[PDB]
Design an enzyme around this catalytic site. Structure first.
Site, short mmCIF file in Angstrom:
data_model
loop_
_atom_site.label_atom_id
_atom_site.label_comp_id
_atom_site.label_asym_id
_atom_site.label_seq_id
_atom_site.Cartn_x
_atom_site.Cartn_y
_atom_site.Cartn_z
CB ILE A 71 20.14 42.25 70.96
CG1 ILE A 71 21.53 42.88 71.11
CG2 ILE A 71 19.85 41.29 72.10
CD1 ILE A 71 21.73 43.73 72.32
CD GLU A 160 21.56 52.07 67.60
OE1 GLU A 160 22.22 52.23 66.52
OE2 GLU A 160 20.33 52.00 67.67
NE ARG A 163 22.75 48.90 64.08
CZ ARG A 163 21.65 48.70 64.79
NH1 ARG A 163 21.23 49.63 65.63
NH2 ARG A 163 20.96 47.60 64.66
N1 LIG Z 1 15.98 43.10 68.31
C1 LIG Z 1 16.33 44.38 68.14
N2 LIG Z 1 17.58 44.58 68.70
C2 LIG Z 1 18.14 45.82 68.64
N3 LIG Z 1 17.52 46.90 68.11
C3 LIG Z 1 16.25 46.73 67.55
C4 LIG Z 1 15.70 45.48 67.62
N4 LIG Z 1 14.47 45.52 67.03
C5 LIG Z 1 14.26 46.77 66.63
N5 LIG Z 1 15.33 47.55 66.94
C6 LIG Z 1 15.47 48.95 66.75
O1 LIG Z 1 14.26 49.54 66.92
C7 LIG Z 1 13.98 50.53 65.80
C8 LIG Z 1 12.94 50.11 64.98
O2 LIG Z 1 13.23 48.91 64.31
P1 LIG Z 1 12.17 48.09 63.47
O3 LIG Z 1 11.65 48.93 62.30
O4 LIG Z 1 11.04 47.68 64.44
O5 LIG Z 1 12.84 46.68 62.91
P2 LIG Z 1 11.92 45.33 62.79
O6 LIG Z 1 10.67 45.69 62.08
O7 LIG Z 1 12.61 44.19 62.04
O8 LIG Z 1 11.57 44.82 64.19
C9 LIG Z 1 15.38 50.62 65.10
O9 LIG Z 1 16.14 51.71 65.76
C10 LIG Z 1 15.91 49.43 65.26
O10 LIG Z 1 17.38 49.40 65.15
#
Ligand SMILES: Nc1ncnc2c1ncn2[C@@H]1O[C@H](COP(=O)(O)OP(=O)(O)O)[C@@H](O)[C@H]1O
Ligand SMILES: *[C@@H]1O[C@H](CO)[C@@H](O)[C@H](O)[C@H]1NC(C)=O
Length: 245
Positions: A71, A160, A163
């Site tokens: 999101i 989720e 997925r």
């Molecule tokens: N904007 C987001 N919207 C939905 N879920 C997220 C979002 N950002 C991170 N997550 C979730 O948080 C967890 C960690 O993600 P992360 O490694 O931080 O991705 P990124 O580094 O691109 O921010 C995962 O479960 C991931 O699906």
């Protein structure tokens, strides 16, 4: 776009919304019969709009990155709201342009960060369709602490569930009564990236995982996933994060 109306919602209508959400995400191929999300999408095509309506008919539009089902942000009346992360700032160049003001939330969408901002881990936040009605109501008017909890509910009940079939079914069970996520729900959320990577690597390793993945099963028991014949691959996971990401 896709839509979900909590007024008159039942397990069947929620299942239709999740099917709509999955089918709006582009893929050029399947790996072991599971759609492979694209490595990249340029411009406005990177974003899907989800229109969510609470029991009262009030609406938010949520912007979703089609590469990873993340999101980015949402529109409530004339105010846009975006996570504090570079992909969300880029999304704000393409979506909700006509908003009167744009608020950057004081956190990224990272689960650990949202949990610190909410004051509670996912393990202790009830989810379900009534929880999603509450979350839409919370996001209609800015409250950053309240919004962190609402967004943890929103992400789990949309992205989720898209997925994993199991998580879709857990929210269907919670159509009329919220309940904290099952152990298998948290396990699958935490393992989506890992499972996606191991399924793609199993192309070239005879359907064998280069690194087995430890999950919690639907009975609350450890299951070690070593290959693509596992129920998590054949029935449960519905979308693969591209290993380029
Ligand atoms: N904007 C987001 N919207 C939905 N879920 C997220 C979002 N950002 C991170 N997550 C979730 O948080 C967890 C960690 O993600 P992360 O490694 O931080 O991705 P990124 O580094 O691109 O921010 C995962 O479960 C991931 O699906
Ligand atoms: C593959 O995974 C399945 C899980 O359904 C398991 O039965 C099997 O022992 C695993 N290993 C091999 C070598 O197939």
């Amino acid at each position: 776009d896709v839509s979900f109306r909590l007024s008159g919602a039942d397990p069947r209508s929620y299942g239709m919304f999740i099917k709509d959400l999955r089918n709006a995400l582009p893929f050029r191929e399947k790996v072991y019969n599971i759609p492979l999300l694209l490595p990249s999408v340029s411009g406005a095509g990177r974003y899907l709009l989800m229109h969510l309506f609470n029991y009262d008919g009030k609406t938010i539009t949520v912007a979703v990155d089609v590469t990873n089902v993340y999101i980015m942000g949402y529109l409530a009346d004339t105010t846009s709201y975006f996570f504090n992360e570079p992909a969300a700032e880029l999304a704000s160049q393409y979506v909700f342009r006509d908003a009167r003001r744009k608020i950057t939330l004081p956190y990224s969408g990272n689960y650990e960060r949202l949990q610190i901002a909410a004051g509670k881990p996912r393990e202790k936040i009830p989810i379900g369709l009534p929880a999603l009605d509450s979350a839409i109501s919370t996001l209609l008017h800015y409250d950053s602490t309240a919004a962190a909890g609402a967004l943890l509910v929103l992400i789990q009940t949309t992205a989720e569930a898209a997925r994993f079939k199991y998580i879709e079914q857990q929210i269907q069970e919670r159509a009329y009564r919220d309940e904290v996520p099952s152990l298998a729900t948290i396990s699958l959320e935490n393992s989506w990236s890992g499972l996606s990577k191991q399924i793609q690597l199993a192309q070239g390793n005879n359907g064998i995982f280069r690194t087995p993945i430890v999950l919690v099963d639907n009975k609350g028991n450890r299951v070690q996933i070593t290959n693509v014949t596992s129920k998590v691959v054949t029935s449960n996971i519905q979308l693969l994060l591209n290993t380029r990401n």
